[PDB]
């Protein structure tokens, strides 16, 4: 009857639902739009602002704001809007009626963690809340409490090592690169071949190419050779106007950027290296567990055959005879949500929440302790 | 007070990106205090958004707008777009023709007509409505006939008799023959004056067709009409264009009327 809430908010997508489902109730873009010009839709009165999915669908008569940058909240007054819409329009619930578990970026400035709390208790008057680190929850989703997680969503990619359920701050790795970037390059390179990707609908077509045609090459060279000799690992994709087009090596050049930031001119190590760098920056004793416990989560971790490359990469950098194991659960698109729902539903966790009284008598700081 | 209806072939991002083509659209739009633009193929409102940018880049409120979600029975979709000058007219209420239910709009209308209660202090008519239609060519007879039901509805909801009805009705040549005029209550009824005649050429192509129309009911709105101000707007001549250029703006001329 009186059910808990789970809300995983990302750079691009919000994942909102109830504690105990498998199963976000709502997935919608994390954007706030405001009318650039004065007017109305038919049957409808003036709109002050568009949130989430009507924001994107009416983009062209709006100025958009993306409140979450690289994983962290940077505009607070737009984010309230995003939560309000999440509560009342998307879920259709009353906030004061529901305990709410929120998720959070790795290496979240302490200051932010406090705002989230004050707003939930104050703007939304929630009875109970808790903040959990995203990677830490997607790790729970898999059924461990120790391991290494590679978060790769829309704007950021993280390497987060976990022991005992403790995220290990000092050793996290952060590549300022993700899907949005990957999409960009795939646009740039398709426009290179002699294609037009100007329209909003076109710049959104490219995004589905990524999600349908792209795999990672286990060996990049062979793969470049395979496409240049046999000339038939090309697939095709039907654009809106009847027009279909052929896609070739472009398919796997795109994802490869992750291992070679050098494709967009970034003096950052690729993801196989940053994952290694992460491990050999932890306590020596627990590293065994870490090799045999690589868990994959995030939108950009869905490429058919990414895990395999990771599987056959670190082998090279790992000690010669190490047990490398890589877990990428099929539902890992929403692995982070799934873990939050788990956490907030289990009758044992019921204590770890923050009370109403507890925020009032303590302060906004209660969250550094109990979370 | 000039009123116009303008079918702009495949009006979208591609058209608005092109600056020659955009200056002319703006040149034509600026002619009017109320213009209906049809054949809006703009999935995210970027073309619409681009145009208002041009019309409001100086004074912020040169124009305000009314726009529909994309309509069509099947997957090919388009929107109706109304631009008006807020300082001469205002909008009291708008709605979409629903045939009396949720999913009934498409029971007679491929593109469910949009209805607008304009308020005009400058003219003899103080409040009047405009009904917008761009019919399905293969079903023009029925659709236009169906505008009569839409007029009855406008009387029922708004208790208003003074109604302009207009759009690309496809009301000529192949699509509506002489014998078929008798099947259209909108034409055989004494309630409506048809301002654009049958001999009019509302197409930018080499066809001679009276497709785009303007229809008025109700004494006050009829009396407001400046005689001989209903007419097609031949922009090719008006702007001294080549055919190819005129053609790449649209294959229809706006229909206009002036009210006093």
């Amino acid at each position: 009857e009186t059910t808990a809430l789970v809300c995983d908010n990302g750079s691009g997508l919000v994942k909102a639902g109830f504690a105990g489902d498998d199963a976000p109730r709502a997935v919608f873009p994390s954007i706030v739009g405001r009318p650039r010009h004065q007017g109305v839709m038919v049957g409808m009165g003036q709109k002050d602002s568009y949130v989430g999915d009507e924001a994107q669908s009416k983009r062209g008569i709006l100025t958009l704001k993306y409140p979450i940058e690289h994983g962290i909240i940077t505009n607070w007054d737009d984010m309230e809007k995003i939560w309000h819409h999440t509560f009342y329009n998307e879920l259709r619930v009353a906030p004061e009626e529901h305990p709410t578990l929120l998720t959070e970026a790795p290496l979240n400035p302490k200051a932010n963690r406090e705002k989230m709390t004050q707003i939930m208790f104050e703007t939304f008057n929630v009875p109970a809340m808790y903040v959990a680190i995203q990677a830490v929850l997607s790790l729970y989703a898999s059924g461990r409490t120790t391991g290494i997680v590679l978060d790769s969503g829309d704007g950021v990619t993280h390497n987060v090592p976990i022991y005992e359920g403790y995220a290990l701050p000092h050793a996290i790795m952060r590549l300022d690169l993700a899907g949005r970037d990957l999409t960009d390059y795939l646009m740039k390179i398709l426009t290179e071949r002699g294609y037009s990707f100007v329209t909003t609908a076109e710049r959104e077509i490219v995004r589905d190419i990524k999600e349908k045609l792209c795999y990672v090459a286990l060996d990049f060279e062979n793969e470049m050779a395979t496409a240049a000799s046999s000339s038939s690992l090309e697939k095709s994709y039907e654009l809106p106007d009847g027009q279909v087009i052929t896609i070739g090596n472009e398919r796997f050049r795109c994802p490869e950027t992750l291992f070679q930031p050098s494709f967009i001119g970034m003096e950052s190590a690729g993801i196989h290296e940053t994952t290694y760098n992460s491990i050999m920056k932890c306590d020596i004793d627990i590293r065994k567990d870490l090799y045999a416990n690589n868990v994959m989560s995030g939108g950009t971790t869905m490429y058919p055959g990414i895990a395999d490359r990771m599987q056959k990469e670190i082998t090279a950098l790992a000690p010669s005879t190490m047990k490398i194991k890589i877990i990428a659960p099929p539902e890992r698109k929403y692995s982070v949500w799934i873990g939050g729902s788990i956490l907030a539903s289990l009758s044992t966790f019921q204590q770890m929440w923050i009370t109403k009284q507890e925020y009032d008598e303590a302060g906004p700081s209660i969250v550094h302790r109990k979370c | 007070l000039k009123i116009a209806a303008f079918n702009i072939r495949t009006f979208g991002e591609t058209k608005m990106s092109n600056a020659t083509l955009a200056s002319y659209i703006v040149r034509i739009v600026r002619r009017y205090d109320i213009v209906l633009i049809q054949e809006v193929r703009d999935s995210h409102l970027v073309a619409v958004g681009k145009l208002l940018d041009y019309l409001n880049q100086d004074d912020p409120n040169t124009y305000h707008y009314v726009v529909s979600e994309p309509l069509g029975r099947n997957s090919y979709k388009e929107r109706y777009l109304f631009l008006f000058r807020p300082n001469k007219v205002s909008v009291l209420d708008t709605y979409q023709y629903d045939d009396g239910c949720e999913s009934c709009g498409n029971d007679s209308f491929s593109r469910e007509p949009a209805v607008v209660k304009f308020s005009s202090h400058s003219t003899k008519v103080k409040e009047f409505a405009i009904v917008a239609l761009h019919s399905a060519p293969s079903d023009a007879v029925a659709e236009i006939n169906s505008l009569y039901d839409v007029y009855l509805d406008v009387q029922q909801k708004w208790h208003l008799n003074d109604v302009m009805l207009m759009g690309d009705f496809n009301a000529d040549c192949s699509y509506v023959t002489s014998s078929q005029w008798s099947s259209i209550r909108l034409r055989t009824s004494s309630t409506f004056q048809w301002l654009i005649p049958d001999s009019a050429d509302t197409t930018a192509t080499s066809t001679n067709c009276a497709y785009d129309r303007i229809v008025v009911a109700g004494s006050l709105l009829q009396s407001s009409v400046v005689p001989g101000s209903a007419a097609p707007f031949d922009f090719q001549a008006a702007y001294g264009l080549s055919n190819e250029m005129a053609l790449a703006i649209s294959d229809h001329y706006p229909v206009e009327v002036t009210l006093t």
Partner: peptide
């Protein structure tokens, strides 16, 4: 960890969530 080891075990041993459909709106128009 505030009531942790226990909670740590509940996660490893597992939990069975139930079915809710989803209108995931991350298809690119």
């Amino acid at each position: 960890t505030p009531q942790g080891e226990d909670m740590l075990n509940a996660i490893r041993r597992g939990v069975k969530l139930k079915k809710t459909t989803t209108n995931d709106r991350s298809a690119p128009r």
